With several copies, the nearest count.
Chain A
Amino acid sequence: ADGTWELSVHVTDLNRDVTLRVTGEVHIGGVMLKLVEKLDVKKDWSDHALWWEKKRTWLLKTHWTLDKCGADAKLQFTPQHKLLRLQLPNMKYVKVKVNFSDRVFKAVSDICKTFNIRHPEELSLLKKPRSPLSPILAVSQPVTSPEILAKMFKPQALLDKAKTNQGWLDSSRSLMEQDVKENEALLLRFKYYSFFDLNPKYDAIRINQLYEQAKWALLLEEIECTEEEMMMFAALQYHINKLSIMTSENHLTTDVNPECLVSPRYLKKYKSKQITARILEAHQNVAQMSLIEAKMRFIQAWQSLPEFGITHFIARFQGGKREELIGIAYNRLIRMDASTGDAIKTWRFSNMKQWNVNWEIKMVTVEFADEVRLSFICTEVDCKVVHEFIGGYIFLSTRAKDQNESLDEEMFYKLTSGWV
């Protein structure tokens, strides 16, 4: 009976298990070809790959013996590309087809190209607790019925907001390795609060979503501000809504009278219908820029808040008595009291010579110039998220205005992955 080593492969596309005869020397490319020859010889399998759930690994290296990878194994023959449900910062839901075997950093970059969102390295995916398709993003609707915000206005302590930051996916791993089933809702968010070349001439949608993340953070008290400041954000948002109304005037519903706007030579050369249509086309771009400029001011006022741009994680600091918070921002680390939110001590990245992570004890140790080391303990989950956040912000600070139109993803991975 030769050397029957029964291998059961589940094909997610057909919900059908299949069993094959192998010898342990048969290649990855060998078994895939055995799948198609047994199932539909007409089906397009060119997107399928083998995923080993128990080892939580794709088997993309085709020229690999089964023994080289490692009988009685449960494999899956599944499409690399799947549908991902995303909640945008504007709180609208969207659906996207992504290769669930690409590292999330590359996946996020590809999702932002689809959405025409420059600089994807400032964005990433975040997990929720417990919908059109694309190869809306320009909506920016206001908080409509009070019940929608009231249902979302459930507050959270500073320790509870820090627990949410455990859901930042590993940018150096794929969607499949991180417990994302098909049609689960992830949050696409601006993870890093250091926005490179926020240009209103070309970043209309990027600015719109960034403005929407800021808007919802403020009215849901994710970030606090004084009563006076909230009144200004409300008037700023009320202004953005009004400016948004002006961009939607058409041929009907226009008060454009060229006789009061252009020189009499134009009134005499063309009919009004040719003039006004030319005004309205130019006015659409003119009103759109006032809209973007207003959102930019909303973002900059948000940026100027004392709490702005800080991501909190539960940490047990060396020599500390209780659970406190380590705050990560674009230029500094903050030791913070987990009860009051008062900053206790700040360290600048410019004085950080290097840092390290002991993955056994789950200890981040940051070394500085002319200052004793900073050491703190996190959970195993937060330890890797914290390491990516630090390396991520460091990576962003190296971005140069030398038209460096080339993201060295290798340097990001080198800055943000200790292979856990």
Chain B
Amino acid sequence: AVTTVVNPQYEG
């Protein structure tokens, strides 16, 4: 029931 998408453009 959950979707997860891990930011490609994650700098921090």
Contact = CB atoms under 8 A, between A and B. Distances in A.
A354 B6 CA distance: 4
A226 interface: no
B1 A350 contact: no
A1 interface: no
Nearest to B4: A356
A266 B4 CA distance: 47
A335 to B, nearest CB: 19
Contacts of B4: 354-356
Interface in B1-12: 1-12
B5 A355 contact: yes
Nearest to A415: B5
A418 interface: yes
Interface stretch (A290-298, A312-320, A390-398): A390-398
Contacts of A419: 3
Contacts of B6: 353-354
A350 B11 CA distance: 5
B2 A398 contact: no
A349 B8 CA distance: 10
A397 B9 contact: yes
Contacts of B3: 356-357, 359, 387, 417-419
B1 to A, nearest CB: 5
Interface residues of A, number: 24
A356 B12 contact: no
B5 to A, nearest CB: 6
A354 B5 contact: yes
Nearest to A363: B2
A369 B11 CA distance: 9
Nearest to B8: A398
Given A351-B11, A352-B10, A414 B5 contact: yes
Nearest to A420: B3
B2 A350 contact: no
A405 interface: no
Contact of B5 (A356, A358, A359): A356
A179 interface: no
Interface in A335-356: 349-356
Nearest to A396: B9
Contacts of B8: 394, 397-398
Contacts of A394: 5, 7-9
Interface of B: 1-12
29 contacts: A349-B7, A350-B9, A350-B10, A350-B11, A350-B12, A352-B7, A353-B6, A353-B7, A353-B10, A354-B4, A354-B5, A354-B10, A355-B7, A356-B4, A356-B5, A357-B2, A358-B2, A359-B1, A359-B2, A359-B3, A369-B10, A369-B12, A390-B5, A394-B9, A397-B8, A397-B9, A415-B5, A417-B3, A418-B2
